[PDB]
Ligand binder design. Structure first.
Ligand code: CTP
Ligand code: CTP
Ligand code: ZN
Ligand code: ZN
Lengths: 152, 310, 152, 310, 310, 310
């Protein structure tokens, strides 16, 4: 999607997280500590998109994401489009695939899980199923619907 | 080296059918041929962050039967290594620089798994972690079934009591589900039914199971009648009374039981098995407990010795 | 408006915070929830100021800031400028003045303070002591160096 | 017989520089060459009148590593041998007629010393007596310093935290003060400063020491950065918060640390050492704890065997 | 004398529709025109064999607002009358010779009815007896429903939470069932569903009720949304986590609510009502608690004042 | 209405010199001419989340001496409202619908100020909140100083003991600092010195204060010798022994005292005032405690009686 009003300049080498379903942008930036870098960053919050009404967009420079770091966006911005860029050209363009493992960012719902009081990173096996994603904690081995885990 | 050498034993979901047969084969050998010196010079930590006398005595005895020394503690109203402040991670990083293996029981799910991330090369054996796993109880149960039935395939297994909350029956069902042609009978108050996730696992592997109001309906065909304790403290006094009645086993109920049939119970029992059942040839709950010794010895030997000339 | 030699963007109406120090931009959008608003927000981080080298920058559409809200910005980013932009022309360039009362974003360092387990908003008393601003909790009436309060 | 044969180990003030080197030399040998049968047939009492899981497990493990048997107890809310009435003197006169050596920890200062007056020929090893001594912690600390630095002379030693109340830092300072050219850096809130009596002892021997507001000021020159736990329960919540901040160690502070530099902490830590420090080459607190095993084995061997063909 | 004069108040089932109305009308009158000397010279026993600060204070404040004197005790962690030695029967026999009425809460079902058989002419008001009755909580709930809805008939009432074990929702249901045209909506996890006997009771009376997964299904048509605490210990932590969402309230869930809808909760809320609900015109749990004093005053007035000069 | 009518009483810092004087004048009047029916029909909550028998009794006696009714509780070793589950906010929200004022003591700093935000029109008097404020103790101290010295200005006041942690000496200092020409003498061990912020406060007001090692240095010129308990747990037993002499009083230390000098102590004394001081004309700690009722009565009178008919 373009903007015949005010378009944000491109860059040589970096990545572009387009189609961010607005009000998920900043979250992506929090959850994944995307701002904990010196590289040039450019955010676009709540913007015009003919293919979904409104959408956020993040641009990080001299920084790329493996197919996995991109898959990690799955649960938040599934229809996003990660754009690999170099010499001002969109040399790469991948979409978030549901990963088989999600680490560090989720918090286990089980208040009795050992993960809470301890110096370890949360970790969940991802399993897709009709209507939701089943997430099973590495520690307590309990499985929860992603709506419960992501549940604010 | 054997397949279980230096491996952590945390969950039944991590053990394969061959792992299980390997543990039970080693158990029968140690039972028939004791190696009281196999682990001499090995020091093992018996860490019961959660007190559990029956399990600890069983596990410590197994340790001594192989010749190992033991150091440890129970509960945390006495202990000064985590009572309020120090992480379980630090407690393990310390203890693992002293001992050759850690046996531990803990109130929170996942504690044994967290321990393996901080014990370096020291094997961690889970003696129970909250409502999640209790793998050695499952190994002892399976050793007892295999030993009294001669197989782990094509058995009629009935489970009675609190199937909802018993971590022990969930585990045994998962373990048995690794073998073929087993059929399950679940007898429990609707309030304590075997959880849907276990039933899903079963349907998924084409394993037959069916619910029944009384043991009476399955007695003629049962090979193993596995009784569980009803977590009364969870229910209502009036409620617990209203149903307990149909999940209590009496000697007269064994009237049409097969000759090979065995009654198991991880213990303690109290209101689920009347004392008159104790004298019948079917009562095998105390023999089941004595087998925890051979199951736990096997697990220690396999994990601490590369090759067992058993 | 953010030009060098290519595409540039600008907002119709709304406010515009400029010259935020190193990685304080994300923190300000964090603390003060500057992105909770579903208006056309746009952020620049680690931007090339030249007159420093780097800095962050924000901008909200259809949103205005009182001289008050503009004050809470003094502890993390002293010198800067918020700008109201009605009719594509900044009709106002103010400055964040150190306030007397900082609410909701600070956490009292006294672990025994009644504010922790309760449905109340934090509240401190601002009082600089030869550069080492002291903070006094409204509830436990204890006072800490802003270095201790902000640490967490 | 070795100089420590049949001697009581109660206080660091009773040990000479040669005693200390003898214990550390024996420790390195047992660490390199284990004698799992040295104390076979010896029975040792592990008497923790004051519960202390980490110290007891460490001490009991050392006992087993040399082949000795152990009997004992912890705390006194369970014990029926002094809970209210029988003197410590009588408790020792009895226990010393059963065992070959007594390891004990007690809440009152001087308890280990009182025990030697009633144990006849049975050696008493002090595992801690209130706020007075903790000699084996000091021996383990010194073994760790000697082992990572190769010496106990001419070292730059920084001590951080609660220097006022930590019996462990007082002891280590006294022990190190028995060697030459050591220099000390004390970093502590004024409310928890290293006591004047220790500073007097130092001035008296011409040992240099100096106070510093932050670790930052000493990092470039430190060989051993010894962190202590801050006895929060002693302070005010607001107070403890106001200063803790400048006595907490983070991985970034090790930026300009020497290659040989080691961070020690008798443990448990919590708010003094961030977890990110654990992965650096400098974190040596868990290695320090594992060394308590060799230090305590050495002490037991020296005290119970006349000559060690180590 | 009035219909309730010198009568015991044990169970909502012993109270008629007229009785309930007489209490509410009396409560309305006292709220409007206080009578601080009505029970002047009466002495009431506030006997909390089972502690309950909120309920005890509410009740004692009501005694004082009518000018009665109060004697009593809380939590009987022992008590030399009514638990560890003496029978409850003897405790009441003695206590009934001292006071004019007894207000009591006990952990065992039937306690208040039993007291009634030993208190002679001294009225006993049940402040709670195990999982059986809690009459005054229901009178306070109904007075609260009647005051904010203008009536107790043809109402749409939703009950949420632990419908299985909450004695309070069981009584409110029975009481509302004595009126006409009330429609019930029961929202609870299957493990905590409204009991079958309550449902059967409703069927005979021809009262309409349905089950729902969550609040939103009925939010747009309820007059009263009665929330209850889901005791965390009831469920397994993970079970509790997988189901709590369906039984908690936030203000954003209120967009559909009728302008007249009030949210009640016998308290404590905490896990079920977010504090953002507090500021809405729908929150009425604190006003409900406040009404406890008018309902409790009414009751003491009626039972102790022959001719209630309303 | 009077200046304090319906006002909260949280911190001495929120009370002006005039306020302090208004309370003392009111207290003098009630002492002289009692008014046992002044708060007739008022109902006060005496909420001691933190137990304090001496303070609770003092306060409840003051409620009764004015004729108010009292409801309440002590030590919240749990409490189902204000600690283990329910927030303090909800506890007050509920309690403020029952009573006319709330007197409360809590272990956490800021508790009383927080209550104030949820009590609506119900005044809250702070009976103690952690190490923060204790307003009524200071009003009782000042009334006691004013009555025995004829004034609260140009006084020579010595404070002894734990000046570091005693919330009571911190408030008395602040209150006396609102008057003019008061001279302070602070006698405390270095580990327990009067805080820097109190000293700074005094410097800005231009108030004179000095530090001293012991009582005798200033004994001949003090009008008030205010003693405080040095909490034994604060210090190390030996530390406590090496320093306590400098902070305890015997009658022989009184030979220099001015005929007008009174010794105050908020109690318990025991370790700091020998019982031989009891018979001297200087002992006034019990009369001080007695004055607590007149100061507390004054406060309840002022806050609850619109027009205080003095
Ligand atoms: N140097 C560059 C190159 C590309 N982009 C961004 O990368 C995304 C690529 O968009 P485009 O290639 O034109 O494909 P679309 O039409 O956007 O369809 P889709 O959004 O699915 O990719 C856009 O946000 C574009 O602005 C950029 O910011 N800077
Ligand atoms: N419609 C507009 C107009 C202006 N701006 C922003 O307003 C900020 C400040 O511009 P201005 O104060 O008018 O001139 P400056 O050069 O920024 O003044 P200074 O040197 O103090 O920054 C710039 O980021 C500009 O992009 C904007 O985002 N949208
Ligand atoms: Zn988990
Ligand atoms: Zn605070």
């Amino acid at each position: 999607t373009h903007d015949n009003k005010l378009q944000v300049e491109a860059i040589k080498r970096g990545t572009v997280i387009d189609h961010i379903p607005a009000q998920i942008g900043f979250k992506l930036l929090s959850l994944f500590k995307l701002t904990e870098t010196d590289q040039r960053i450019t955010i676009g919050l709540n913007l015009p998109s003919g293919e979904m009404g409104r959408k956020d967009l993040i641009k990080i420079e001299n920084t790329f994401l493996s197919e996995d770091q991109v898959d990690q966006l799955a649960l938040y911005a599934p229809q996003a489009t990660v754009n690999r860029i170099d010499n001002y050209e969109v040399v790469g363009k991948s979409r978030p695939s549901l990963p088989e493992r999600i680490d560090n960012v989720l918090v286990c719902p089980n208040s009795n899980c050992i993960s809470h009081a301890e110096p370890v990173s949360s970790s969940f096996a991802v399993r897709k199923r009709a209507n939701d994603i089943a997430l099973k904690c590495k520690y307590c081995e309990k499985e929860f619907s992603h709506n419960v885990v992501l549940a604010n | 080296a054997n397949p279980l050498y230096q491996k952590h034993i945390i969950s039944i979901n991590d053990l394969s059918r061959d792992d299980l047969n390997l543990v039970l084969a080693t158990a029968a050998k140690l039972k028939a041929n004791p190696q009281p010196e196999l682990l001499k010079h090995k020091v093992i930590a018996s860490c019961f962050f959660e007190a559990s006398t029956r399990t600890r005595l069983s596990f410590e005895t197994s340790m001594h039967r192989l010749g190992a020394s033991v150091v440890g503690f129970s509960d945390s109203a006495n202990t000064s290594l985590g009572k309020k402040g120090e992480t379980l991670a630090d407690t393990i990083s310390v203890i693992s620089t002293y001992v050759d293996a850690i046996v531990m029981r803990h109130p929170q799910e996942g504690a044994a798994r967290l321990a393996t991330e901080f014990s370096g090369n020291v094997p961690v054996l889970n003696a129970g972690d909250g409502s999640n796993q209790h793998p050695t109880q499952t190994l002892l149960d399976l050793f007892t079934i295999q030993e009294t039935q001669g197989r782990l395939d094509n058995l009629h297994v009935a489970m009675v009591g609190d199937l909802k909350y018993g971590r022990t029956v969930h585990s045994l069902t998962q373990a048995l589900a690794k073998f073929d042609g087993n059929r399950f009978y679940f007898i429990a108050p609707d309030a304590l039914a075997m959880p849907q996730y276990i039933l899903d696992m079963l349907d998924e592997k084409g394993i037959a199971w069916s619910l029944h109001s009384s043991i009476e309906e399955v007695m003629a065909e049962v090979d193993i009648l596995y009784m569980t304790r009803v977590q009364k403290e969870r229910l209502d006094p009036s409620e617990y009374a209203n149903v307990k009645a149909q999940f209590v086993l009496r000697a007269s109920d064994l009237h049409n039981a097969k000759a090979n049939m065995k009654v198991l119970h991880p213990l303690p029992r109290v209101d689920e098995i009347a004392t008159d059942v104790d004298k019948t040839p079917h009562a095998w709950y105390f023999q089941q407990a004595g087998n925890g010794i051979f199951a736990r010895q096997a697990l220690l030997a396999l994990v601490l010795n590369r090759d067992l000339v058993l």
